[PDB]
């Protein structure tokens, strides 16, 4: 307790210092000053959005690169999560990363969660078919237009 | 190895050693350093500031009507940073003649303040008559309610110091908290001139009153001009005021006090010519200002001087 | 009023604490501190 409040006169004692003053650690209560701002906070909180007063401390989190790094370091190269192609000669930069699912598997329900025998090959061929459909699209001028309504798209 | 030591930046046998960074390691910066950001020093030059006005600014506020109307009279009086050489007799004649024609109080008094300032720079003695003729009646006499415009007061005070005049003490006194409360609005140069005059005239008591007010009003002590502090302190021969001045001397800063000593030792010294009126001998106050300086500076070790006579004892 | 009352209380307590000191110690004297030699 002595450490906390030794000669301390008020909780706002050290707030002559800007970087201490907008610390959000103890709460947001010293940063709300006029009614207007308080009401605004109420509103924004009820709508389920962020408090603007909360932004008084800038928190960059840990960047995704740093996270992935700590993971692969803690796992000593994390070989469970690497594609088997990482283990073959001269992997290109896409074999160099972890195993996340991409958007390409999304419409194929034949393979359920465990794909049975030959299913994954079938899927692989479907995927190819689509890549070629895209190629034809680009070739002949029919590709998605960012503006397009439903009849146009049809 | 030698009488000439290695210089640690240019020698690879220092730089690349085990106690420093070898050239085959990765060469990045070790830690960041924020010095200037954490604790910053305020700027004080060793040299005084080159553009500063260095005088008592008299604050000319005139309505831009009488300013045009009175121009051929005012052109003879000081404008900003310009000091026309017109003889003071002429200027006072012009005020006496033309001023009753002007109806404004504020204008008549700005004009008067210019006249006073002009007569302060030439050191003409017959200008206080103007104070007794116009101002004295509604400002200084018989508890008159009226409160003089600041610029006028500054001007008259400045005149009483430039021409050393007993009168100042009466005016100054009216400026404290119960009176006009003008004292906190004084310039540092104002204080400087006041102290110097009072010192020449030799009032310990004037010196004390003034130092007390300066301190209470939070004047800029360290930038009060050293010459004038010295001439003021030099005037102090009375036991009680003397006591006061020791205790007070602790209000200056380290640097200020060192140059109080330097300036003091010069004005009774080599630079005795620098003064229009020679200093008067205070051996006591001189010795004391030197002593004070010595107390407040960092102390150096000269062991052959201290222990010169030391003999050990087996008792 | 309160100051009067509280003054008297103060001396009552001083009186008793002193009497307790003299009683338990046995004499009215005390040692100094190790630093009162100098």
């Amino acid at each position: 307790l002595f450490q906390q409040n030794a000669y301390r006169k008020t909780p706002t004692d050290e707030h002559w210092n800007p970087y201490i003053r907008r610390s959000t650690e103890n709460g947001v209560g010293h940063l709300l000053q006029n009614k207007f701002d308080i009401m605004r906070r109420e509103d924004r909180l009820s709508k389920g959005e962020q408090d603007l007063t909360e932004r008084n401390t800038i928190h960059y989190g840990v960047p995704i690169q740093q996270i992935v790094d700590e993971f692969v370091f803690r796992h000593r190269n994390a070989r469970g999560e690497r594609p088997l192609d990482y283990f073959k000669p001269f992997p290109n930069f896409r074999a160099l990363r972890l195993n996340r699912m991409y958007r390409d598997v999304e419409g194929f329900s034949l393979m359920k969660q465990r794909p049975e025998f030959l299913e994954w090959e079938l899927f692989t061929r479907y995927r190819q078919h689509h890549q070629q459909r895209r190629r034809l699209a680009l070739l002949h001028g029919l590709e998605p237009v960012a503006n397009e309504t439903a009849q146009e798209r049809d | 190895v030698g009488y000439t030591p290695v210089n640690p930046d240019t020698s690879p046998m220092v730089a690349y050693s085990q106690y420093h960074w070898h050239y085959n390691l990765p060469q990045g910066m070790e830690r960041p350093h924020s010095v200037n950001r954490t604790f910053a020093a305020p700027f004080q030059s060793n040299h005084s500031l080159v553009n500063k006005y260095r005088g008592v600014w008299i604050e000319f506020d005139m309505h831009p009507a009488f300013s045009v109307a009175l121009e051929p009279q005012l052109r003879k009086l000081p404008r900003g940073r310009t000091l026309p050489k017109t003889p003071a007799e002429e200027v006072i004649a012009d005020y006496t003649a033309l001023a009753p024609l002007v109806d404004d109080e504020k204008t008549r008094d700005l004009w008067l303040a210019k006249v006073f300032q002009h007569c302060a720079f030439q050191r003409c003695g017959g200008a206080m008559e103007l104070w007794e003729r116009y101002c004295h009646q509604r400002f200084t006499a018989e508890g008159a309610t009226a409160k003089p415009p600041l610029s006028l007061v500054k001007s008259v005070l400045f005149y009483c110091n430039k021409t050393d005049n007993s009168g100042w003490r009466a005016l100054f006194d009216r400026c404290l908290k119960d009176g006009w409360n003008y004292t906190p609005l004084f310039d540092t140069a104002q204080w400087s001139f006041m102290l110097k005059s009072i010192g020449r005239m030799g009032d310990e008591d004037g010196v004390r009153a003034v130092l007390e007010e300066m301190l209470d009003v939070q004047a800029d002590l360290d930038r009060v001009e050293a010459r004038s502090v010295v001439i003021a302190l030099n005037a102090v021969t009375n036991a009680d005021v003397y006591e006061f001045v020791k205790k007070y001397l602790f209000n200056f800063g380290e640097r200020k006090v060192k140059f109080l000593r330097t300036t003091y030792s010069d004005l009774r010294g080599h630079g005795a010519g620098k003064l229009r009126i020679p200093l008067k001998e205070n051996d006591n106050m001189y010795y004391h200002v030197c002593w004070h300086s010595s107390i407040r500076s960092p102390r150096q070790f000269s062991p052959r001087q201290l222990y010169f006579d030391y003999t050990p004892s087996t008792l | 009023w309160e100051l009067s009352r509280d003054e008297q209380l103060f001396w009552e307590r001083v009186e008793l604490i002193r009497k307790g000191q003299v009683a338990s110690i046995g004499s009215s004297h005390k040692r100094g501190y190790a630093d009162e030699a100098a």
Binding site: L1, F2 | - | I17, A38
Partner: protein, 124 residues
């Protein structure tokens, strides 16, 4: 942290409920007046006093033991014993402990001293 004569006169006329002014004067032979709103814990007892429970302290000194949040102003003849006492109060961790130097001598114009210590060092 210090408390000056001004603060002392102010607190004489305008007391605060939870500010305690504690008299540290050691010898009863030397103390003839009463600093207003003060209480008596002589310096010699402090180390013991501050280790009593609230109740026990009440029984030994006859007044309530200040909580550790409250302002505690210490008092002595010169301001020496009040200082040492202060160190005691600070070591039990009391958050506001002020010593009033020059204390009872300045208040009452007495010249007394807590300890006899002289400025002159005996030649080595």
């Amino acid at each position: 942290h210090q408390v000056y004569l001004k603060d002392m006169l102010h607190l004489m006329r305008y007391p605060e409920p939870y500010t305690h002014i504690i008299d540290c004067r050691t010898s009863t032979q030397k103390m003839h007046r009463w600093v207003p709103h003060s209480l008596w814990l002589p310096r010699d007892e402090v180390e013991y006093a501050l280790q009593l429970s609230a109740d026990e302290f009440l029984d030994m000194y006859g007044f309530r033991k200040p909580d550790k949040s409250d302002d505690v102003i210490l008092l002595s003849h010169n301001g020496i014993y009040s200082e040492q006492a202060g160190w005691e109060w600070k070591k039990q961790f009391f958050q506001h402990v002020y010593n009033y130097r020059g204390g009872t001598n300045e208040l009452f114009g007495e010249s007394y001293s807590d300890m006899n210590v002289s400025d002159v060092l005996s030649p080595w």
